[PDB]
Protein backbone atom coordinates (compact mmCIF):
# COMPACT_ATOMS: atom_id res chain seq x y z
CA UNK A 1 0.00 0.00 0.00
CA UNK A 2 1.40 3.41 -0.95
CA UNK A 3 1.96 6.13 1.65
CA UNK A 4 -0.79 8.79 1.81
CA UNK A 5 -1.82 10.94 0.08
CA UNK A 6 -2.51 8.91 -3.06
CA UNK A 7 -4.92 8.80 -6.00
CA UNK A 8 -7.49 6.05 -6.57
CA UNK A 9 -10.24 5.65 -9.16
CA UNK A 10 -13.68 4.27 -8.36
CA UNK A 11 -14.29 0.94 -10.10
CA UNK A 12 -17.96 0.96 -9.09
CA UNK A 13 -20.37 3.49 -7.71
CA UNK A 14 -20.54 3.58 -3.95
CA UNK A 15 -23.80 4.74 -2.45
CA UNK A 16 -24.45 4.04 1.21
CA UNK A 17 -26.75 4.90 4.13
CA UNK A 18 -24.10 6.46 6.38
CA UNK A 19 -23.32 10.19 6.51
CA UNK A 20 -19.62 9.59 7.30
CA UNK A 21 -19.18 7.80 3.98
CA UNK A 22 -17.89 9.25 0.77
CA UNK A 23 -20.25 8.39 -2.03
CA UNK A 24 -19.37 8.54 -5.70
CA UNK A 25 -20.01 7.33 -9.23
CA UNK A 26 -17.81 4.89 -11.17
CA UNK A 27 -14.64 6.52 -12.62
CA UNK A 28 -14.54 9.16 -9.86
CA UNK A 29 -10.97 10.16 -9.09
CA UNK A 30 -10.45 10.30 -5.33
CA UNK A 31 -7.52 11.39 -3.20
CA UNK A 32 -6.97 9.03 -0.26
CA UNK A 33 -5.74 11.07 2.71
CA UNK A 34 -5.99 8.40 5.44
CA UNK A 35 -6.01 4.62 5.56
CA UNK A 36 -8.69 4.05 8.19
CA UNK A 37 -8.14 0.35 8.74
CA UNK A 38 -7.54 -2.84 6.70
CA UNK A 39 -10.75 -2.41 4.65
CA UNK A 40 -11.60 1.34 4.53
CA UNK A 41 -10.02 4.53 3.19
CA UNK A 42 -10.81 8.14 3.99
CA UNK A 43 -10.49 10.60 1.13
CA UNK A 44 -11.92 13.35 -0.97
CA UNK A 45 -12.75 14.93 -4.29
CA UNK A 46 -14.23 18.23 -5.45
CA UNK A 47 -17.89 18.47 -6.47
CA UNK A 48 -19.50 20.64 -9.18
CA UNK A 49 -19.12 24.02 -7.43
CA UNK A 50 -15.63 23.19 -6.19
CA UNK A 51 -16.61 22.06 -2.69
CA UNK A 52 -14.52 19.35 -1.10
CA UNK A 53 -16.55 16.20 -0.46
CA UNK A 54 -14.90 13.83 1.97
CA UNK A 55 -15.55 10.65 3.93
CA UNK A 56 -14.84 6.95 4.21
CA UNK A 57 -15.33 4.20 1.63
CA UNK A 58 -14.27 0.60 0.98
CA UNK A 59 -10.84 -0.04 -0.47
CA UNK A 60 -12.45 -2.78 -2.59
CA UNK A 61 -14.44 -0.15 -4.58
CA UNK A 62 -11.36 1.58 -5.99
CA UNK A 63 -8.06 0.89 -7.71
CA UNK A 64 -4.79 2.68 -6.95
CA UNK A 65 -3.31 5.17 -9.45
CA UNK B 1 -27.71 -21.10 -5.00
CA UNK B 2 -30.86 -23.19 -4.98
CA UNK B 3 -32.90 -23.70 -8.15
CA UNK B 4 -34.82 -20.55 -9.12
CA UNK B 5 -37.09 -19.11 -7.93
CA UNK B 6 -35.72 -18.41 -4.47
CA UNK B 7 -35.99 -15.64 -1.88
CA UNK B 8 -33.03 -13.42 -0.91
CA UNK B 9 -32.65 -10.54 1.58
CA UNK B 10 -30.64 -7.41 0.82
CA UNK B 11 -27.64 -7.08 3.12
CA UNK B 12 -26.85 -3.57 1.80
CA UNK B 13 -28.78 -0.92 -0.10
CA UNK B 14 -28.31 -1.06 -3.86
CA UNK B 15 -28.97 2.30 -5.50
CA UNK B 16 -27.57 2.01 -9.01
CA UNK B 17 -28.65 4.44 -11.74
CA UNK B 18 -28.07 1.83 -14.48
CA UNK B 19 -31.26 1.33 -16.47
CA UNK B 20 -32.61 -2.21 -15.85
CA UNK B 21 -30.88 -2.61 -12.46
CA UNK B 22 -33.18 -3.35 -9.58
CA UNK B 23 -32.73 -1.04 -6.57
CA UNK B 24 -33.60 -1.70 -2.97
CA UNK B 25 -32.97 -0.83 0.65
CA UNK B 26 -31.16 -3.04 3.13
CA UNK B 27 -33.47 -5.83 4.45
CA UNK B 28 -35.61 -5.89 1.27
CA UNK B 29 -36.90 -9.38 0.50
CA UNK B 30 -36.50 -10.17 -3.20
CA UNK B 31 -37.53 -13.16 -5.32
CA UNK B 32 -34.71 -14.25 -7.65
CA UNK B 33 -36.41 -15.46 -10.83
CA UNK B 34 -33.27 -16.04 -12.86
CA UNK B 35 -29.52 -16.23 -12.49
CA UNK B 36 -28.15 -13.87 -15.14
CA UNK B 37 -24.50 -14.79 -14.91
CA UNK B 38 -21.83 -15.54 -12.26
CA UNK B 39 -22.31 -12.16 -10.55
CA UNK B 40 -25.86 -10.91 -11.23
CA UNK B 41 -29.31 -12.08 -10.26
CA UNK B 42 -32.53 -11.01 -11.91
CA UNK B 43 -35.51 -10.68 -9.66
CA UNK B 44 -38.39 -8.67 -8.39
CA UNK B 45 -40.47 -7.45 -5.53
CA UNK B 46 -43.57 -5.46 -4.82
CA UNK B 47 -42.47 -2.02 -3.64
CA UNK B 48 -43.97 0.22 -0.95
CA UNK B 49 -46.37 1.74 -3.52
CA UNK B 50 -47.77 -1.69 -4.37
CA UNK B 51 -45.97 -1.92 -7.71
CA UNK B 52 -44.00 -4.94 -8.87
CA UNK B 53 -40.51 -3.83 -9.92
CA UNK B 54 -37.79 -5.99 -11.38
CA UNK B 55 -34.25 -5.95 -12.70
CA UNK B 56 -30.71 -7.11 -12.10
CA UNK B 57 -28.64 -6.73 -8.95
CA UNK B 58 -25.43 -8.09 -7.39
CA UNK B 59 -25.47 -11.59 -5.85
CA UNK B 60 -22.92 -10.10 -3.41
CA UNK B 61 -25.42 -7.60 -1.98
CA UNK B 62 -27.92 -10.26 -0.88
CA UNK B 63 -28.17 -13.45 1.19
CA UNK B 64 -30.25 -16.49 0.27
CA UNK B 65 -33.42 -17.20 2.30
Amino acid sequence: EPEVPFKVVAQFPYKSDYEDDLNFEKDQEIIVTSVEDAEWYFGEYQDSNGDVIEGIFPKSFVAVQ
Amino acid sequence: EPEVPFKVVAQFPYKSDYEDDLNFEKDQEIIVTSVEDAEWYFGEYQDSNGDVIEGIFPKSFVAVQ
Binding site: F12, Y14, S16, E39, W40, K59 | F12, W40, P58, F61
Partner: peptide, 11 residues
Protein backbone atom coordinates in the same frame (compact mmCIF):
# COMPACT_ATOMS: atom_id res chain seq x y z
CA UNK C 1 -22.67 -7.40 -18.10
CA UNK C 2 -19.51 -6.05 -16.46
CA UNK C 3 -18.39 -7.00 -12.95
CA UNK C 4 -20.77 -6.59 -9.99
CA UNK C 5 -19.51 -4.57 -7.03
CA UNK C 6 -18.01 -6.61 -4.19
CA UNK C 7 -19.93 -6.97 -0.91
CA UNK C 8 -18.96 -3.94 1.17
CA UNK C 9 -16.86 -4.78 4.23
CA UNK C 10 -18.27 -4.56 7.76
CA UNK C 11 -18.20 -1.01 9.07
Amino acid sequence: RGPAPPPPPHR
